[PDB]
Symmetry: C4
Subunit: 350 residues, 4 copies
């Protein structure tokens, strides 16, 4: 049995397993082009999507991140009327780009229709297991019903899963099973793929179709964005790094003389109340980060620095030509600050 | 010398070394079939055995877990009359399934006979080193004396050990040398096999015989059960995850304003008093977990979630067709929640 | 250049990298033979040498460990008259075995002569770098001067180093560069070999000569002794595990309501005062352990347990036939107790 | 696409991944030759450069380290007149060797000229990404303008980067992208090479040209210097290990009853104020270390000890002939002191 014999053949890498190799460079960081074409009708100035989560992205977040060159995915833990109204708030703030999450439920077709009426630019079909017959069949039916809307669908973590979604007309495949900071899928179900490998395997398929992927989950620092893009992601999706900003939906708390905000998985127990299956996320708090504009400024600055190191004048070169080097945990220790008592907080390092 | 030259050839994986790869799925988690045939006369509704330990399973535990679809192994740190009486309590609670542990001692044959008189469904011949001449010879003699009883025998961690036990008529081989949470076998004797590899090597033999194995020890989360089953285990045995429940034999203590219960290895010093050799277990305490019904509900929910991800409609497909991906410690860090202060305890994550 | 190209070819394992595989066994732990012939005139009942260190072995320690079946190496941080007098105390306690450490200094020949006059059974030529021209030349000269004395010489960590010492008539080669608990050789000089690999490479040479080796340093638990012997060591040398016993030279201190004893490297600054080069050891304290008899009882019990698991009826079988399995750090975590609050101290686990 | 297929082919090692193998030795540590020819006109008695950082090296540091056999790189976070004046202070302290850092800015040519007028011995062209067209072109122009000055240029971490700099007449290539203790390049930009591999790849090129390299960053102990030199570095550059000395520019602070000094990356926010791009360093404090003379004495003593172990009579033999052994994290744990409560601080181990 080939299936029995190859049970443990596959290997997987995540962000902390790899570094990008410096290469000959002709481009300064400030001259790098960060724009990316997600689909023929959807181009971003910076390759960053904000996560469709009820503690990350409502209209306030989507407005802030679109003004920085990204796009926000308004979460679906609200009525169809409310979610459409959030989209109208974004479009009425200068015609900014806006995306909106939908599930595979009995309201999906009406919800998509009202979101399109509100001016939405992308529909984000968000499911725990995108590589399933019922999901692929509904997606294909959505694709034929709404022929002109940009469709993001996920999540998958394998070539075969990304191919199954591109085959039914998905424009953008969202990649990531288990890497999220608030996620417990891998300890509760035992299922996942290390995220760098998942990006790489799915990007290989996306290139064959001429489409794009979103690297979703597990990003901890600006350098992880560069790794995610160089592994083949056309853009990334961020929760943890946008959590605790002014524009995120919560209100700040004071715990032990310091400001925090709530960040919780959409599969946590509390989040599923807001909208049977056992939880696959936890509920937590993160330190108050400040404004989205300031955070994106640091992220973008890390991407530009990385691309100056790799000689990437645009994201295409970073995706196609940047090489990695594998490292051990000892290499990870060398990569972070070591043998030093940090006295002042850096704006891009905690 | 081939033995000298191959001293370090073998490699071993445990649960934290691997993840299950998501695959094309046609089955929702709630429609998954969790039943397993351990032997022609013994079928379980959920593939879970409770450990034959004096701080895990007496009649109260065996009743609770059988009512959830599993089976309990009543421990043998009691007289023959007492252990038979515990079995009668289980059978008088609605004819529930019941198993009972026996050693290889001078009372084994009488103890097995009285347990069969009490209505026991499986005999669990529990030994530290199942792959030994004296144990295999007594087991074979038990097999010929009691021809119709389901026999579990262990523990082994190699193909040759599992084969030696199946060769003398053992119905179910219990697998695990050293992985137990309360176990020190590997630091005291230096002996063991990482548990995923041990399950896989033994399951390969079990398939040749048409018999089954129990993956015993080292399970920390519900996702480890899915890994254990996908590595070839027909069912798992749990101590740590059932420790501290209402139905476990101890009484709850209050330490620093919180409830705990005693959990100790059957090879710890205190456990061997209750029933020379140096200890191979420690004595500890675990937080109070609540009822067995609530804990099994979370475990079962993780198994169903995992099988929906792998597209396994029953445990046979999970055993034969699910693939793994290997990961580093960095991948393990990504798999658990990271970079977040958990504020609310999840029912399936500590 | 082959030397340039193979700079990083070699790989090395230590105790925490490996486990012993259980095998078919015909021998109970209590029936195992632990005796070992170190040289034609030197046989031990248990394969354990106590370290020649000024906080481990003087006459009191050598007496206690010889009474348990081992042999003690009286340290040389004392005059020739004093060290010879310590040996007389051992021989006057029932003719017990006794060994004594010598350096390569300008008193070595007189010191060896007086120790032989006192009845010493083995001379332990202790040097930091045994694989050096000056050391090998003095050793060869000692071998020809004292033709009938058992000679231990070390330390080396490679086949070529062990071969160089056996070539000049060394009876027993002591193996270990850097693994000691109190040792900083590897961080100060950058030099060493992981200890399991060092034992294995040197044992390969020892078998060709028909001689023996002592696995010296890095032993943390009784299971490490079994790994050390199965990797090819004929016996082990212990410092850390005998430190803090009643029979060790220090007096007990009380720190924060608990008893401790001093344990320090013979290359620490303080130890070199007692007897230029930069220190290669640290000075520390360990918890009070109790009597040597009780500690050896636990160690011996772990060895017997390990050999029952591997089916080794004597140490020859363990050396020649026991197989290992390699494991990751995740496997190490599974091997120790995990996910449990230990409440009672085990006699063989801290 | 070969670039796509080889995205993860490369592997990298750092100091904690490797140990030096002991070898046959004819040379005592005190007889080892530590001198190194960096360029035909620049020879050092010990192979150590002090880092060109505003919390490490001004005239006071450069004087102290030159008096120990090394050379100091006076940092450039000061005017041209001030930096030239610091160099005059060094030359007026007995004609000691002195080096000075320059950037690639609009003052570089005047700054180099005034530093040469002051008697500087080496120019250290310090850039974040030495493998860039603009940097290589300015360096080549500096080489043709100042034909007789020793030129150090960096930093690179690849063979192709080192080759590009040697091709334009650089005498000494400085190697290290990301390993620095105060450095965040690898987490902010995602870019780097584990330092042992980076030294080895660049040294391979340096040998073809007959030139030299400086191993810059990540050195934590004296043993790391030996590893860095044996991996092919002709000398090392130190920040962390010289930070907090009397001769470093800061003044000592008292924090919680203990003395500290400020150590900060030249890419930290505060350091860039002293002289847009996002920070790539943090600001911290280190314990007060004492005098440079005492620290160098310990470092040099570790190098001599290492070379006695490897049988290296001079640095050429260490570079060309010393072999390494690879180890896991378990091997790293064995290499440091373990299972001991250090009571007295060692002069070469924290
Ligand atoms: C409860 C869990 O929730 C989540 C898991 C992962 C990511 C999340 C992100 C946002 C919100 C919730 C999330 C879940 O839906 N689990 C789950 C597990 C296996 C499944 O398998 C299927 C499925 C299989 C075959 N056909 C259709 C669906 N749905 C599944 C849902
Ligand atoms: C003291 C130790 O106890 C246990 C070890 C491992 C798992 C446990 C689970 C429940 C209760 C006690 C356990 C033990 O029996 N150790 C031990 C070690 C090696 C042995 O080897 C043999 C043996 C070898 C050859 N023939 C017969 C028996 N019995 C052995 C017992
Ligand atoms: C100071 C250090 O001390 C020790 C190191 C390692 C183990 C110890 C155990 C007990 C007591 C002291 C120890 C040492 O001797 N280091 C040292 C380092 C390199 C050497 O190289 C040579 C040497 C090389 C070539 N010929 C003769 C001697 N002796 C050396 C001594
Ligand atoms: C802000 C950062 O600062 C440093 C980074 C690394 C080491 C440091 C050591 C001392 C002082 C500052 C350092 C930097 O210059 N980053 C940076 C990143 C990418 C770059 O790419 C280029 C570049 C690329 C192509 N042509 C010319 C320059 N310069 C770059 C500078
Ligand atoms: O509770 C959940 N379980 C599993 N994954 C989740 C859950 N909630 C959000 N996610 C995923 O995790 C991503 C955010 O991960 P982060 O950026 O690492 O914090 C989201 O964009 C989702 O893809
Ligand atoms: O003290 C002992 N020493 C070694 N293994 C033990 C001991 N007691 C119980 N076990 C094993 O450990 C299992 C429980 O492991 P856990 O589920 O990881 O807590 C039991 O089912 C036995 O197989
Ligand atoms: O200070 C020293 N530096 C390096 N090795 C030492 C030093 N002192 C003792 N040793 C070695 O370390 C062994 C003890 O190691 P332990 O059993 O792991 O504590 C001794 O038998 C010596 O071989
Ligand atoms: O802030 C910075 N970012 C990145 N690297 C730096 C920065 N400042 C200094 N370095 C490098 O780090 C080296 C010192 O590293 P350390 O010896 O490990 O403390 C310096 O010689 C520079 O090569
Ligand atoms: Cl449409
Ligand atoms: Cl029967
Ligand atoms: Cl003699
Ligand atoms: Cl010039």
């Amino acid at each position: 049995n080939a299936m029995w014999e190859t049970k443990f053949a596959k290997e997987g890498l995540t962000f902390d397993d790899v570094l990008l190799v410096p290469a000959k460079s002709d481009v300064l960081p400030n001259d790098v082009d960060l724009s990316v074409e997600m689909a023929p009708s959807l181009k971003l100035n910076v390759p960053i999507w904000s996560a469709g989560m009820d503690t990350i992205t409502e209209a306030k977040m989507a407005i802030a991140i679109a003004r920085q060159g990204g796009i926000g995915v308004v979460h679906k833990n609200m009525s169809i009327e409310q979610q459409a109204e959030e989209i109208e708030k974004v479009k009425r703030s200068g015609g900014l780009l806006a995306a909106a999450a939908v599930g595979i439920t009995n309201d999906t077709f009406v919800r998509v229709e009202k979101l399109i009426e509100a001016g939405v630019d992308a529909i984000v079909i968000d499911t725990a297991h995108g590589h399933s017959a019922g999901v692929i069949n509904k997606i294909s039916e959505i694709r034929q019903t709404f022929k002109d809307v940009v469709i993001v669908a996920g999540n998958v973590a394998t070539a075969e899963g990304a191919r199954a979604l591109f085959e039914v007309g998905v424009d953008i495949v969202k990649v990531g099973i288990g890497p999220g900071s608030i996620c417990t899928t891998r300890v509760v179900a035992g299922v996942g793929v290390p995220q760098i490998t998942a990006i790489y395997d799915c990007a290989t398929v996306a290139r064959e179709f001429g489409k794009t992927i979103i690297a979703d989950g597990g990003i901890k620092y600006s350098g992880d964005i560069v790794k995610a893009l160089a592994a083949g992601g056309n853009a990334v999706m961020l929760g943890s790094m946008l959590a605790g900003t002014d524009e995120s939906p919560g209100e700040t708390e004071i715990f032990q003389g310091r400001q925090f905000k709530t960040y919780r998985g959409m599969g946590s127990l509390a989040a599923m109340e807001h909208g049977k299956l056992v939880p696959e996320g936890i509920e937590g708090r993160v330190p108050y980060k400040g404004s989205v504009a300031d955070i994106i400024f640091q992220l973008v600055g890390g991407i530009r620095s990385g691309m100056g190191y790799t000689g990437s004048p645009d994201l295409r070169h970073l995706r196609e030509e940047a090489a990695f080097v594998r490292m051990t945990g000892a290499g990870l220790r060398e990569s972070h600050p070591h043998d030093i008592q940090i006295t002042k907080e850096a704006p891009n390092y905690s």
